[PDB]
Amino acid sequence: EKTVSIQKSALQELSAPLLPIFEKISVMPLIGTIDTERAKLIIENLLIGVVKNRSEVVLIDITGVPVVDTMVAHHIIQASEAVRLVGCQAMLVGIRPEQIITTNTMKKGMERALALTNREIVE
Amino acid sequence: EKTVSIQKSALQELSAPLLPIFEKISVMPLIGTIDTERAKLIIENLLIGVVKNRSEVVLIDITGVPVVDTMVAHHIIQASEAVRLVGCQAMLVGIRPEQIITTNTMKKGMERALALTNREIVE
Amino acid sequence: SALQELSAPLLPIFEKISVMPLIGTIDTERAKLIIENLLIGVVKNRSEVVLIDITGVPVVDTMVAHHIIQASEAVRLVGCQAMLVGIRPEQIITTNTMKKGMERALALTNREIVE
Amino acid sequence: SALQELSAPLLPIFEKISVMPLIGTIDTERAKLIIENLLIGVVKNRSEVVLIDITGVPVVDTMVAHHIIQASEAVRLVGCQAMLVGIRPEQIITTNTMKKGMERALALTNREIVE
Amino acid sequence: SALQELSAPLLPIFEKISVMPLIGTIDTERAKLIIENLLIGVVKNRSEVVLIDITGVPVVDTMVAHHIIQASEAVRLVGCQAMLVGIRPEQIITTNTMKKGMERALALTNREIVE
Amino acid sequence: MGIPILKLGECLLISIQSELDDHTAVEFQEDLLAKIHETSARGVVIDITSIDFIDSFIAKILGDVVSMSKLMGAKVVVTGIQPAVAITLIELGITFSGVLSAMDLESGLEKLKQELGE
Amino acid sequence: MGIPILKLGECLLISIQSELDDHTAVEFQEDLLAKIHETSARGVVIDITSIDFIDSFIAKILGDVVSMSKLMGAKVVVTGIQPAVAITLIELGITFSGVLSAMDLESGLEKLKQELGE
Amino acid sequence: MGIPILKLGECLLISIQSELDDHTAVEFQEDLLAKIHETSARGVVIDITSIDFIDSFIAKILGDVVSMSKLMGAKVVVTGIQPAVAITLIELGITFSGVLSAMDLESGLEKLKQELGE
C-alpha cells in the first residue's frame, strides 16, 4: 500500500460535458474522503461552471456524516448554481435522522438541466 | 490488509447522460486492467447501444499495448451499430508505431454524438 | 435435427438460431443459400441473440454473412453477446436488438413504416 | 430437444414450429406462455406451415390458442396444410402465409405500414 | 525532338498522348507536373486514344496518376484500349470518350452546359 | 459462338450459357472488351445463371473481366449467381467487392440503370 | 525559432521554410501538438511550398504529423506541394489518403472551410 | 533563411518570431516591400506578439514599414503588441496614427477585411 492507496485518492473525477458539468461518485463514502467536494469546488470555477450534478446512483452508503455531502450542497450555490442529487438508493434515503433538487435517474437530470438554462432536445 | 486492490478495478463508471452512454478513465492504463473494455462491453448491450464516449483526457500515458484499447474501437461496431475517443494527449499520441472517430473535447464530442442519434441541442 | 427456423416475411428473410455448437450443423449455411433464390428477397437478418460461445466456427458463420452480398442485399448479425466480441482474432452492418435491426432493414431497401 | 424457436421482435411477437409432433414436447406450451409476460406482445402468430400430420397434439395446440386470448390478445394460426384440416371437431382468426398474417395482425392493433 | 503534349481549356487543363511505347520517356510525368503547378490546375485528362501499348511498367505512369491528387486535383484516364488493359497483374476514375470525360469533369468544378 | 452480346439501350445484357473451358473464356475475354470499345457503352450486365461448376482460373478470369470493364469505364454488374458456385467462393479467397452484384436479370437492369443518369 | 503558428478562428496555420535535418523536425513535431492542446482547432494547414528537396526520414515525419494531428480532432491540409518533392520522392512508403491536399494557401482555406467549420 | 511571410486571400500575414540586429531588420524591410510588389496586395497584418524587447534602432524599422507600406498602396495593421514593448514605444514617443492596431491576429483581420474590400 505504498502508492496504490494515494493514486486512488486521485479518483474522484469531474468530466466536462455540455455546460452543466456533471460528476460520477462511485465508491469513496468514508469521512477520510473529504476531497470529494474539495476537488469539486476548486475545479468548479476553473472551467466555466454552471449547475452541477453529482450522480451517486451506485453508492452504499454514507455512514453518519452527510455534513461533508449534503450540507455543502448549499455551498455550491455560492460559486456555481443550484446543484442536483441524482438517484439515491433505497437503503441510502432510509438514513434520515434529520431543500435540494433531486432526480430519480441519470438521464432525467439532464432533461431538467437544460430546462434551467433554457434548452431542449429537438429533432 | 489488501482491501485497496479490491475496488480498484471497479472505478470505470458508465453513467448515461442523454442516453448514448458516457465514460471516463483516469491514469491507470496498464495491461492488467483488461476490464477497461470488458466491463464497458457487458453493460453496453445492457443499456441502449448507441455511440460510446470514452473521454480519456486524463490518461498519461498508455505503455505499449493499445491493441486492447484500439482493437475494441473496431469491436464496438459489434453489438452497438458505434464508437468515439475523446481528447488524447500529446505524449499519448507520440506512441504511434503503426478508421475510428475522435474529437478534441466532450462539448464538441456531444454535438456530433447527437448527430448519429439524429437530435439537436438548440435554444 | 433438421432445425433451421427460417420463418420468412415478405422481402426480408431472417433466422432464429439457438446453440448449435458443431461444424456438423453446416446445413444452416446450405439451406440458407438455397432458399435465397427460391424467393426474391433482399435483406437477411441473423439474430444470434442466444448463442454462447463459439471457438472455431466463424469460418462458416462470417463467410455465409459475406457470400450473401454477392447474391442479395447485405446482412446483419444481430445481438453478438458480451462473451463473443472478445473472440475475434480476425466490414458489414450490424445492430443490437432484433426489432431495431428490422427497422434498419427497410431503410436500406427503400421502405419505411408509418405509426 | 429442449428448444424454443421463438424470435423476439416488437409487439407482433411470432414463432415457428418445425416437425416435433410428439406430446412429450409440452415446452411449446410452456416456453411460449411463460415467455409471453416477459415481453409485451399483443398479437401472436404460430406458422405451423410444415408439419404433417397431427393426431394427438392439437388439443394442446388449441388450448394454447385459447390460453393466449385470456393472457393478452389475438393468437392467430398461419398457414395450415391440406391434410391437417381433415377432421377437426374443434373461434380464432387465421390466414394463409406469414407475409400476410402480419398485415392482418398490425391492422388489429390499429397500427399501419406505408412505403 | 522532345514534345509530349499540352493544352489549356477553360479551367481544367488536359493533355494529349499519341503512341510512344517506352519507359525512358519519364518526361511525360515531369513535363506534366512542372506545368500543372504553374496555372491553376484542376482535374486533367490523358486520352490514350492511340497508344498500343505500354509494355511492362505503367506503374510509373499509374502511380503518378495518384500523385496529381496530392499536387492539385484528381486525374482521369480517357479511353484505354481493349489490349492496353489486356492483362492486369496489379482507385482512380476513368471515362470512355473525351466528349463525356470532359462532361463529368466540369461536374467536379460544378459547372453544366446549358443552351 | 456461345456468347451473345445484345447492345440494348446503352447496356449489354450479355448472357453466359453452359460453357466450361478456360480457353473459351480467353476466347470470351476479347469479345466483351472489343465490343464495348468499338460500341461505346456504360454498363455491362453479365449473367451466369446457367453455370454450376467453375475452375480456379474461371474465378480469376471472371475476377478479371469485372475489373477489366470497370477500368474501361463501365459499372459492370453480376446477376444471378447460383448457390453451389457461390459455395466454392468461400474457399477460393476472391474478393468480389466493388462489383455490384444483383439478384436476377429483371432487378439487375434497373439497379445499374439507377446508377447512371436515371 | 523559425516555425511560426498564427491561429485564425479555430483554424491554425503553418509556415515551413527550407529545412536541412530531421533534428529540426523533432523539436518542431512537439511544437505543433503543444499548440493544438492550448487552443481548440478544426483544421491545421501545413504549407510546404518553400521546399525543393526532402530527406527520406523527414518524409516519415511530415507523413506522421498528419496522423499526429488527426487524433487530436482537427483535419489537415498539405497545401502547395512542389513538383520535384512530389514526383519521385513521395512514391516511398506513404499511405496518403484522407489528406485533402490543396494548391495554394488562399484556396487551401476554402477547401477546408467548405468541408469543416462551416 | 529569413522571416517567414505568407499570403492569404488578398491579404498578407507576416509573423515575427525573433530578430538578431538591425541587419536582420533591414533585410526584413527589403523583404516585405519587395513582396508586396512581387504580387498584388491590399492589407498587411504584422504579428509581433512574440517580441518582449525592442531597441530604438529597431522600432524605427517597424516605424518605417508601418508608414512606407501606406505610401506603397496598402493599409497596414500591427496586431498584438506586448505590454513590455508597448512601454518603451511611447517612452521613446512615436504615434502610430492611421495604424489601428488590435489585440490578436484573429481580431486584427476583422477590421482590415471589413474596411477595405468589404
Author numbering:
A (entry chain FD), B (entry chain HD): 140 to 237, 251 to 275
C (entry chain Q), D (entry chain P), E (entry chain W): 148 to 237, 251 to 275
F (entry chain O), G (entry chain f), H (entry chain d): 1 to 118
Source paper text:
In bacteria, the stressosome, a key inducer of the stress response is a very large nanomachine that responds to diverse environmental changes by triggering a protein partner-switching cascade of events, which culminate in the desequestration and activation of an alternative sigma factor. Here, in a first step toward understanding the molecular details of stressosome activation, we report an atomic resolution cryo-EM structure of the L. monocytogenes stressosome. The stressosome contains 20 dimers of RsbR and 10 dimers of RsbS, arranged in repeating units of 2 dimers of RsbR and 1 dimer of RsbS. The L. monocytogenes stressosome core proteins, RsbR and RsbS, display the signature β-strands-α-helical arrangement of a typical STAS domain where a central 4-stranded β-sheet is flanked by one α-helix on one side and three α-helices on the other.
Next, to improve the resolution in the core structure, icosahedral symmetry (demonstrated by Marles-Wright et al. in their study of the B. subtilis stressosome core) was applied during the 3D refinement using a mask that excluded the turrets, yielding a 3.38 Å resolution map. In the latter map, the density for the C-terminal domain of RsbR is well defined, even for side chains, allowing the structure of this RsbR domain to be built. The STAS domains of RsbR and RsbS each form head to head homodimers. The total buried surface area of the interface between the RsbR STAS domains within the RsbR dimer is 1027.3 Α2 while that within the RsbS dimer is 657.6 Α2. This difference in surface area buried upon dimerization is partly due to the fact that the C-terminal tails of the STAS domains in each RsbR subunit overlap to form a large interlocking interface, absent in RsbS. All dimer–dimer interfaces, whether between RsbR dimers or between RsbR and RsbS dimers, involve residues in helical secondary structures and flexible loops (helix α2 and the flexible loop region between helices α3 and α4, for example). This is in contrast with the fact that interfaces within RsbR and RsbS homodimers are formed by residues in β-strands. In our model, the phosphorylation sites of RsbR and RsbS are clustered at the dimer–dimer interface of RsbR and RsbS. Interestingly, T209 of RsbR a key residue in stressosome activation is located near the flexible loop between helices α3 and α4 (the α3–α4 loop) of RsbR between residue 237 and 251 region that is disordered. Therefore, this loop could adopt two conformations, one (closed) preventing RsbT access to T209 and one (open) allowing access.
